[PDB]
Amino acid sequence: AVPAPNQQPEVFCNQIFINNEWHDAVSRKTFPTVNPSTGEVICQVAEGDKEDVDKAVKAARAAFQLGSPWRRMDASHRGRLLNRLADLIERDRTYLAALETLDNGKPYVISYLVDLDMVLKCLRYYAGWADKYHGKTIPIDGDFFSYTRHEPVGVCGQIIPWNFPLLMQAWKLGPALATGNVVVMKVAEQTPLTALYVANLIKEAGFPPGVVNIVPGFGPTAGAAIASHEDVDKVAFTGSTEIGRVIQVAAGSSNLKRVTLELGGKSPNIIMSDADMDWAVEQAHFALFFNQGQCSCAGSRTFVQEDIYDEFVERSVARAKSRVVGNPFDSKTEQGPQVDETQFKKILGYINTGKQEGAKLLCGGGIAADRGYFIQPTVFGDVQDGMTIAKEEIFGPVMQILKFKTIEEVVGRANNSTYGLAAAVFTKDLDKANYLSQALQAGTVWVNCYDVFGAQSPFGGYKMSGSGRELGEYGLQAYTKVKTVTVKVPQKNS
Amino acid sequence: QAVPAPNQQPEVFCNQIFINNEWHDAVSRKTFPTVNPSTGEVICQVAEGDKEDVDKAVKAARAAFQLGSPWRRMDASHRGRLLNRLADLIERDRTYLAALETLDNGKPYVISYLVDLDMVLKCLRYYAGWADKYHGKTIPIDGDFFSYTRHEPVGVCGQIIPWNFPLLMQAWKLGPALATGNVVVMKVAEQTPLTALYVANLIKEAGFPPGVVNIVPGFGPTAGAAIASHEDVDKVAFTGSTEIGRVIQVAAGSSNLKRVTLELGGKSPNIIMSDADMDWAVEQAHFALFFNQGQCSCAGSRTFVQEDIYDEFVERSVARAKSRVVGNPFDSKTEQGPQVDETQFKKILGYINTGKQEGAKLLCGGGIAADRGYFIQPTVFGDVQDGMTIAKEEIFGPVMQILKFKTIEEVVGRANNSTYGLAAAVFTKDLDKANYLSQALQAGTVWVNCYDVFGAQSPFGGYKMSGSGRELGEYGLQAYTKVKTVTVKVPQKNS
Amino acid sequence: AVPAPNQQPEVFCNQIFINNEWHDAVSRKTFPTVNPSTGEVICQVAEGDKEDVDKAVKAARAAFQLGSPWRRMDASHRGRLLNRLADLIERDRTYLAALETLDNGKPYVISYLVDLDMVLKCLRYYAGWADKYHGKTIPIDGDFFSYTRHEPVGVCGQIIPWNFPLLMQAWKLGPALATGNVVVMKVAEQTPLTALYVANLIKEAGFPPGVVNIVPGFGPTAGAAIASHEDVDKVAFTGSTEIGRVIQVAAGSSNLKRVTLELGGKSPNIIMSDADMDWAVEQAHFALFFNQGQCSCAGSRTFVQEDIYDEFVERSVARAKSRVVGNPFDSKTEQGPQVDETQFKKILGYINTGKQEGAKLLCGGGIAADRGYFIQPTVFGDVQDGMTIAKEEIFGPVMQILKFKTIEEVVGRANNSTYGLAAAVFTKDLDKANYLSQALQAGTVWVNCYDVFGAQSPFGGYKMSGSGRELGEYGLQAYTKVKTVTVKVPQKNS
Amino acid sequence: AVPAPNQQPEVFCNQIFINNEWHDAVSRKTFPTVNPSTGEVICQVAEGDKEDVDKAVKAARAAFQLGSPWRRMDASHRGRLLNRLADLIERDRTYLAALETLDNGKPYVISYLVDLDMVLKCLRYYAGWADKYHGKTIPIDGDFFSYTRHEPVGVCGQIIPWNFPLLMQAWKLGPALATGNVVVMKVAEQTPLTALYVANLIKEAGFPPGVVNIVPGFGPTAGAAIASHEDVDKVAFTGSTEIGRVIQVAAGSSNLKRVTLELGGKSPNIIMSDADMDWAVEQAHFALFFNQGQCSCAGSRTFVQEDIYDEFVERSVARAKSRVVGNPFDSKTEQGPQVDETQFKKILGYINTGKQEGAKLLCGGGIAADRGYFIQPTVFGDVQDGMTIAKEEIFGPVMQILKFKTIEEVVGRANNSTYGLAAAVFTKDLDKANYLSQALQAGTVWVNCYDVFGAQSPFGGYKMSGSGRELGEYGLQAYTKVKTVTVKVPQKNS
Numbered sequence A, C, D: 001a002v003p004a005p006n007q008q009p010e011v012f013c014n015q016i017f018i019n020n021e022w023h024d025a026v027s028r029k030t031f032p033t034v035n036p037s038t039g040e041v042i043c044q045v046a047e048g049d050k051e052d053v054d055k056a057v058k059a060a061r062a063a064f065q066l067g068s069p070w071r072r073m074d075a076s077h078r079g080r081l082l083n084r085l086a087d088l089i090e091r092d093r094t095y096l097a098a099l100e101t102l103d104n105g106k107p108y109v110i111s112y113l114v115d116l117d118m119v120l121k122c123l124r125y126y127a128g129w130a131d132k133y134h135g136k137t138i139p140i141d142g143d144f145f146s147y148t149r150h151e152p153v154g155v156c157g158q159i160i161p162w163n164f165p166l167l168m169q170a171w172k173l174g175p176a177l178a179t180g181n182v183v184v185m186k187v188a189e190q191t192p193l194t195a196l197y198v199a200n201l202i203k204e205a206g207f208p209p210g211v212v213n214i215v216p217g218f219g220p221t222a223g224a225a226i227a228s229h230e231d232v233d234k235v236a237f238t239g240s241t242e243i244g245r246v247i248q249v250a251a252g253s254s255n256l257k258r259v260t261l262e263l264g265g266k267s268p269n270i271i272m273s274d275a276d277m278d279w280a281v282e283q284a285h286f287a288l289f290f291n292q293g294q295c296s297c298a299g300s301r302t303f304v305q306e307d308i309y310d311e312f313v314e315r316s317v318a319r320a321k322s323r324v325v326g327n328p329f330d331s332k333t334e335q336g337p338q339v340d341e342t343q344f345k346k347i348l349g350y351i352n353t354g355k356q357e358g359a360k361l362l363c364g365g366g367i368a369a370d371r372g373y374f375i376q377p378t379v380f381g382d383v384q385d386g387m388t389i390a391k392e393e394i395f396g397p398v399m400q401i402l403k404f405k406t407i408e409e410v411v412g413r414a415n416n417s418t419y420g421l422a423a424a425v426f427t428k429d430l431d432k433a434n435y436l437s438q439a440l441q442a443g444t445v446w447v448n449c450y451d452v453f454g455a456q457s458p459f460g461g462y463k464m465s466g467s468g469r470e471l472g473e474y475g476l477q478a479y480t481k482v483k484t485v486t487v488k489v490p491q492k493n494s
Numbered sequence B: 001q002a003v004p005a006p007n008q009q010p011e012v013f014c015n016q017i018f019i020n021n022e023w024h025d026a027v028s029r030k031t032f033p034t035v036n037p038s039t040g041e042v043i044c045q046v047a048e049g050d051k052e053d054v055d056k057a058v059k060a061a062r063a064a065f066q067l068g069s070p071w072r073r074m075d076a077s078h079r080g081r082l083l084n085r086l087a088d089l090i091e092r093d094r095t096y097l098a099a100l101e102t103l104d105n106g107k108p109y110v111i112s113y114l115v116d117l118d119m120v121l122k123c124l125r126y127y128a129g130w131a132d133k134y135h136g137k138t139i140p141i142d143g144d145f146f147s148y149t150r151h152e153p154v155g156v157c158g159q160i161i162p163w164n165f166p167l168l169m170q171a172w173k174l175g176p177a178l179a180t181g182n183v184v185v186m187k188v189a190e191q192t193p194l195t196a197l198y199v200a201n202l203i204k205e206a207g208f209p210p211g212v213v214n215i216v217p218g219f220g221p222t223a224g225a226a227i228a229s230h231e232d233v234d235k236v237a238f239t240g241s242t243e244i245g246r247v248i249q250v251a252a253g254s255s256n257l258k259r260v261t262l263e264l265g266g267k268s269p270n271i272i273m274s275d276a277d278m279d280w281a282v283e284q285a286h287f288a289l290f291f292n293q294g295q296c297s298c299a300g301s302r303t304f305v306q307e308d309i310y311d312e313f314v315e316r317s318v319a320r321a322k323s324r325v326v327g328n329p330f331d332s333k334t335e336q337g338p339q340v341d342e343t344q345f346k347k348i349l350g351y352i353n354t355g356k357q358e359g360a361k362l363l364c365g366g367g368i369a370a371d372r373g374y375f376i377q378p379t380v381f382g383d384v385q386d387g388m389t390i391a392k393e394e395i396f397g398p399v400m401q402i403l404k405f406k407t408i409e410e411v412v413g414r415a416n417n418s419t420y421g422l423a424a425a426v427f428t429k430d431l432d433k434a435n436y437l438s439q440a441l442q443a444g445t446v447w448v449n450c451y452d453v454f455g456a457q458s459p460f461g462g463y464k465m466s467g468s469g470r471e472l473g474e475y476g477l478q479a480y481t482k483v484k485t486v487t488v489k490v491p492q493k494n495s
């Protein structure tokens, strides 16, 4: 049950957010953001640059000063505030789902039922962590009392992508604020709007000024400013593998700030011959096509055992051909447009590359509409490991199906990747499942499911898919600094 | 490693009461005989501790626990060193202790050596590593305060251990209590005090301060009951029959509100799905029931077998029980030794006669295996029904119950229809069946495609009437730890 | 600020709460509850007994059945429910605060600012714990995958005292529900009203029927029925130590149910000569007299170093004499009546006992008013360790001041007690504080403060003051069962 | 209680350690290691370069392969091996302490009682962690079973310094091997000998070949090759802040490997007017001069309250003048030589800068012997914040004493540093101790003591002092990779 969408949501916030106030760029420059369904400009947005980031970092640093409201505040109260934000986001849930859909392209039903639900669950989960992340009292040798405090890292720079604007914002803000940090956040030029509105609610919820600061703008400018800043303590970045290198380089050439990265992937989805066919087919479709295919953990390498290959493919093509593409605000729409023109063209490039290399086109393969960046759900069969489409992140509605024989074989082929973000195993066999989840070199391994995310369970990549983890108790460690205090005592006893 | 040839008649060097690192006679000067179950002959006399010797033990322990004492001041890391030393000393005397364990208890020497001793060693060494790693917390309390917790020793811990695993039970008790800075007054089984008393000697040699560990051999209703009722015992831990754990607890509740943990009986279900690996399932089910002469609280004493494989399984099961070699525990061919004593001997025989009378199908064995010693034939009952006494009551002997079932919903309900809940097992190749069953079974430990798999790392304990609280793992430390909160006014609290 | 109270609040809930339903006793019996300030009957309340307990237990068992809504419910959602309950409670904060004062006698200002706030903070704390109490994956020897599940204990009997009716309810429900248990709760016959109103809010919050059942009645009847019930998996009791020994006895001869107890105390409050005099004096007054002296952790043995003893006693007597006793609804009132005639009489007896013992009566010592159960703030000086008033829990506004010379001396004297619930030290010296915080045999040691409770920090007794802990992560341990699952795997790797 | 030293220990191991075998450098080149007490060459050592690092890494990768002896080994057994290694090191304790002194210069008595003891305690501490670092079972939403495996990070590059050759090696090997990692370790060109002997003991203990590989050589060559390697999964560096940057840059332009740094410091040692004079003076001397002043956490900024400043400075100078410099093998020697000519000249240069900037040279300040790199214990008084010697890590026997007035003042000046490795407070006051321990921006705060290390308490810096922690349970985090496994189940229940 979903409330009727306002298909033309008004935009209220489009400037830079610092100290709970709205600011034009120092330069007074602005940039257009576009509706990827129509190609029409939604509105102009403040274009943040190095000098704007400087203002934002200075505001955060002051907010973080010892004895400030934010620093003195009860941990439990940081929790109440996160809970209040959740309630405000829920109050304006219909509006935000619509705004997300307008700015990003994903179906309003998914924005509402998935993205918005997950945002509420993430903030609410982390609200609970604010006063429960304990330090230790330590049985150290000698006549001493030793213990640790789990202190905030400090000023945290956070750069989030366009594929899940609201959710990614929440994945970052939850652990950061629960642990008492202050934030300087750069949002994607493609999808700045929803985050800017949330900043208004952050103000409304009662967060002290300077605790959260959002600077819309371009990456080569605003993003690198954060990563290179001499007073930023930590930088978390979710984006492509390409941009990620550009960040850790800039971040290491400054003040030795802490760095975490959530990057691309080429995740294998393995279908053993004893898997439930109907289930494995629907899940493989879901695994790849979700969010217009725009997921780092997309199941973009579908390994199918030879004995069931033909039937699996047969059933998969029918499912991809029945996938409804169109107006994101139509309840019946399964697939919206790609986020922008640059993505649109790049996806079409990979499709054409697939054909040249001898992959077998089974459906789609071309443009799905003359208006907006709609691409047809595309499926490639008989893919081989050495193909570009088998190796590179496409980030589009393009599915690759490979055939294997043995379980030992597929382990080697699934693991032969510079990526290692996620993987899946579909089988009914207890031993096969335990064998594969242990042997697969990925941060998350799903068994008989896919894209199962909980605020409670960590997500992150092995290898070149990134470092560190988000979500769960683990997501706190990156936003925490350990101080050991060791006190001479008259006589230590047990 | 290879099993060294055993001295089949090892000498006894310790048979008295151990208090403050010294050997005592009982006050009454009374001693009692401990028997060799393989021959029925007396091994030696053992000082017979009673309440008055327990009072000496508790006084001793209390003194060693005093603020400023060597034990209380000792670095936690050092308590770990002490535990490793003890382990090193036991490994030195492993051949001797393994043989002594066989002499006093009856279990095959090869098993004492390769199983019991290895597990004792692994248990002590594991907890040696916990000594300096069980942290309290610092806590982000509201207001201008600094709040933290100290995990302090619970104090004077009375520990009563059974006879089925004398060395191992000792280790399971000493490991966590010593790692966390406690002192102990231990009462060992009258059937098997010898090995525990020799280890008391090793505890001295290892360097533990006097009074940290005190051992009082004696009888249950006297020595054991005195620990449970003592006004200066802070914790009592009892492993044994469900029947006696009831008594022990009843005593603790009427004394000083001491902390109590129990490790009691069971009638654990071993569930064989039709898709199980047959040969594997057959050998594991045999092991699951017959191990240690069937003398395990977690014995797989209700063998549920899916109807399609029932006949084959029962046939293979009876073949294996028929081939199981019973005899002298020092002969390497022996898989089964005598039961622990005559009382058990007869109780098991009684249960067998009950099973026959109540209409269970006697498939093999069924009576005495030798004229001398407490040897019983490995016994298998087929067509066992839930309502039968032998399907309900713990037998603690080499008596196997095999029950037929049809569906997975059926077996879960039947397995869970028990006052016990110590352990359970599931043999199947299907992921969903394993997961469905491991979640649904009301048992403290669930084994999947294996049985009797223990590790110092993984907690062990029962649901329902099989006791309360756990042993082993990090959880074993909780029952031996006391939490103190210290909350301090500070000038200005900041994150 | 504090809103004006309705001094004659209406009563809505006075029956037995089972399956979200209000029931009369099977016997149709009711009992009168009395207003301690006036000695007048407030209303009649259903008198539950063994048959009513038996119905409650059955309902709880049924709600706890595998596949039930409460068992299948996401842990995070149990969290939502506790937060909703807290919200409904805060909604009715002004009303519940007045009802608490009417039935119990404590000053309304304190019911509102202390009791009700701590109730809210408690439930909101545990809401956070619902989906964060993880089991473990364990590196066991051999080719095995071993892990633990932290399952609920099941049907939990909870018996709560009359001194903090609402807060003790929360201390019990928070952890039990966060961990997925079901509850059969016996409330005190002196103060059943506020707890019954909360049950109404538990139904309104959306808790499934049977998850919380509340049976008002008497101890020898309803209480013993819970403790002795064959189908109750755990019993938690807070109250006098004598009655605690009975509850622990009932559980032993039934079904080996897990029992935790929170019992009495005779907590030492240690004042070193280097302490802040003004703070120490006001804190020692607070520590003994708070809640009409009706706290098990009351600082009922005030040890004062001999060099500041004369001055401390002077200030302490003056403070006691100025303490305003009267209508708990008058904002000027610091001290209401004792909870009932039985307590009233007990306190009078203890006062006389001290007098006959040769303790010096420095002020008070009699009845403070005609109506209700009011007792004059009373102070004894030159108290000795062997005195009955120095050893037994008085649970009234009766202060015991003792003189000591050295720190090594006061440690011994402080510890020479069969109780061990709490302790405090007042000093400015770092080493003195550490020495004493380590040496005192108490579950809680306060330094330069007293009665500082936080939802995050555990509370419970050493020795005969009880077993187990409430509050904090520790509060969850008693409400969880550990299950180990150990699985054979093909080949264990790190 | 110290065994007599062999003042000329024989060298048995001087090559590259790969696969438990001793290797010459590919180029066959070698370099001299010097005795800093005599300036004379002890012996030549294999000069490993990029090609050799390449061999070692391949060796490590092979030992880490799924199904290998190290990967299949019981975790408890990894612990048994660490204990065996510790026992072997204890067997050869006299020899190792003598060789440490010979190569490094530290007093033999210190090498024996401090260094080797701490080495033993570190290896034994972590041996105990081997089978106790659990993953989690997670109460995720939905019908799933979700859990984490704590897997090894893989091939770990470890570059260690020359100030604590043996202890540093153990600080790295302990956590790394306890978690099942494999290691390529680069030892200091100045002190490579003891570490290579320890590798012979690693072979003796029974560690599978390729689990530990040691490549002696130079920083710009061997050290850089490790950091830039495309098959190294993690890099841990300890040394100057300068080189730490080089490492973090090289380690970012390669394969996004994990990086932890332990860098320099300029740690504030704060003496309040109510401190114990005798104790504070001896401890401030220890804090600075320990190990020829060669400790990153040295108390190289001694702040003294003006009321006690004069007396503290007088006592400190007297103690510095009394410090015995000489042959490290002489039981009376308190201070040996600096590590090498480079450091020798660098410290004398800092001394020169100190005099040129107008800090009061109170004692020492020159060369202490005609042979070897001995420098007199030096004390500067009236040091100001803006002086080079008050800002830069000197890493030698050069003490700075500063005057302050208020606790608010000293807090601001102590934190006014790009370094935050450690700090200390000497006071008898409870409140002052707590205010400072919280306010000081350092990774370790000592109260009424200094340089108190325990295997159990974590160590590491804030800001430019590095990232991450060593020792304790936290020391395990940088060596662990988290895999989340999420499994579809029939019907989830609590």
Ligand SMILES: O=C(NCc1ccc2c(c1)OCO2)c1c(Cl)cccc1Cl
Pocket: A114, A118, A164, A167, A290, A295, A450, A451, A452, A453, A454, D142
């Ligand atoms: O709808 C779901 N995932 C969609 C999804 C895919 C990729 C994502 C994501 C959500 O969040 C970030 O990346 C989903 C499902 Cl089927 C089961 C459990 C929990 C969740 Cl959240």
Ligand SMILES: O=C(NCc1ccc2c(c1)OCO2)c1c(Cl)cccc1Cl
Pocket: B143, C114, C118, C164, C167, C290, C295, C450, C451, C452, C453, C454
């Ligand atoms: O008001 C307080 N305590 C009063 C109090 C006394 C005894 C109690 C209690 C509260 O809760 C149960 O027992 C109080 C104080 Cl002075 C400081 C910090 C936090 C709190 Cl909650």
Ligand SMILES: O=C(NCc1ccc2c(c1)OCO2)c1c(Cl)cccc1Cl
Pocket: A142, D114, D118, D164, D167, D290, D295, D450, D451, D452, D453, D454
């Ligand atoms: O000798 C000690 N520190 C000397 C020391 C200084 C700097 C260090 C170190 C040891 O290890 C690495 O850095 C020391 C002390 Cl006084 C007390 C407790 C534990 C320790 Cl280990």
Ligand code: NA
Pocket: A033, A034, A035, A036, A102, A103, A104, A189, A190, A191
């Ligand atoms: Na857009």
Ligand code: NA
Pocket: B034, B035, B036, B037, B103, B104, B105, B190, B191, B192
């Ligand atoms: Na015997």
Ligand code: NA
Pocket: C033, C034, C035, C036, C102, C103, C104, C189, C190, C191
């Ligand atoms: Na009342």
Ligand code: NA
Pocket: D033, D034, D035, D036, D102, D103, D104, D190, D191
């Ligand atoms: Na050298």
